[PDB]
Design a protein around this ligand. Sequence first.
Ligand SMILES: C[C@@](N)(CCC[C@H](N)C(=O)O)C(=O)O
Ligand SMILES: C[C@@](N)(CCC[C@H](N)C(=O)O)C(=O)O
Lengths: 279, 279
Amino acid sequence: AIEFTKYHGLGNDFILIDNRASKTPAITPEKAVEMCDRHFGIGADGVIFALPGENGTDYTMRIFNSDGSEPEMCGNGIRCLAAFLADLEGLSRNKDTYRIHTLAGVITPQLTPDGQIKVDMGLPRLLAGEIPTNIAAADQKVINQPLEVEGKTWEVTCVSMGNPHCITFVEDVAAIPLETIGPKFEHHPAFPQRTNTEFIQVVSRDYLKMRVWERGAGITLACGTGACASLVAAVLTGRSDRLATVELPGGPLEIEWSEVDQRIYMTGPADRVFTGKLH
Amino acid sequence: AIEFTKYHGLGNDFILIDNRASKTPAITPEKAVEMCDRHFGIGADGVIFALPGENGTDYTMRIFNSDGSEPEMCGNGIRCLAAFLADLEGLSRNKDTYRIHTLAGVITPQLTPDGQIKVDMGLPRLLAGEIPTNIAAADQKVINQPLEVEGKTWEVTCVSMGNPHCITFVEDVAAIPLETIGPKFEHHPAFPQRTNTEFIQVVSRDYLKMRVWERGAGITLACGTGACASLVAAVLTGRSDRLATVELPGGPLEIEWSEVDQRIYMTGPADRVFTGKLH
Ligand SMILES: C[C@@](N)(CCC[C@H](N)C(=O)O)C(=O)O
Ligand SMILES: C[C@@](N)(CCC[C@H](N)C(=O)O)C(=O)O
């Protein structure tokens, strides 16, 4: 009986549920796992709920990963939700931006004329206690620090966009055995709440190639918070400028670490695929 | 604008299309590839068309694999189609069986009282020219014959259920590196039209454990024609009786090589997942 719309942001694909009638999500995390199963269910990297606003915001976003866990933010998902909300509001829409309450704070997507969505993703969080990670003291940053993974020492930088990211820079990102090494990063003891893991090949100071092993979703074709965190990590390590394209398997995102307000802006597409109803 | 229903037969999942208005499938193979993409489309192992009957049959089935190629039959798909047709007919249904025209001939699913579907899959085809394969002369069977794959010699048996199967018996089917070796069987030069490949672990004379690398779909959770062919191969090589359970990743099928009429009967479930409409 559950009605939903399938979206994807650069192939990071989601089940969107109109949940404006109640602050109670329409499905449990356990049901979200079943729904995200690609063979037995609808198939998705997560379920996103369009919920009633909180504390002045226009709406609230909650997301369940395909493993049922609930992360704090999702950049590809926010872009899908902004498109979804525009469709729900229809001709009653009276603005090009939504203020969206998330576990990570207020996030503000903007529908731009060219069909893209540009998102104010907030300030990056750089202290180890904010990731969270035990690689460094809670009040210290985590920049080009060692992380031993199955005997081999990786150089990693940690950034939070509300959710945790662990970024490592590599010569050939296509050659990373992501299915094998990804889980070992995700569940590394250094990360008490697990982490998302991004492998970054720097092509130039304004062009990064990214692959990601996501917390709670595995190999995905794109991750907005992950691209934001990777750009921040590339600036912090002096490898890139603050404006860059992040090329993902599903396509590109435009990332800016603004020097005006020190916030991260992420611009990318959102595509409605189909509407459906569970049997 | 395309309306569809998602089904799966033991996790072998399909997009079902009501195509009763024309003998011409309403989507092209190229569109079917897009629709089967699990991130950018609906996500499926194939698209199945419910088409007008031919030559006194009740309906016709055509199926496109997720690579766009068109195979001659699909057992999990016929079960899903039988369920779909029963839903389309509703209270106008006046029988428990459909005669369905396929490229492989007439196939007759029966809706049983317990909710399963028992399918008359027809006679197994055992001659090399019927597979087709060049392992033996066209008028010879292919039983425990050699096939060199990347320098290792495998013992294989070939059976056609309208579509080609290459069956090999192994001690530990879970240990097969299916993602790697599968494509090497599928595209082996010995198979002019490619082949489906089944790895079979005999648990007992009435219980086979199967994993499959499918022509045009890769690793799937179940294959009905493949389970039929694997049972035939297990009989031909003296390893099993003619009545057996075939355990697949998605669950079990009951297979019978009838001594009454020498035809193969396949019994299994079919589950309706959701209905949808493409944007
Ligand atoms: C990939 C992601 N959807 C984030 C999903 C949440 C992530 N899997 C986590 O668990 O933190 C995004 O930012 O675009
Ligand atoms: C797996 C299959 N759907 C057959 C699909 C067709 C197969 N991929 C082929 O190309 O012959 C079945 O019999 O249940």
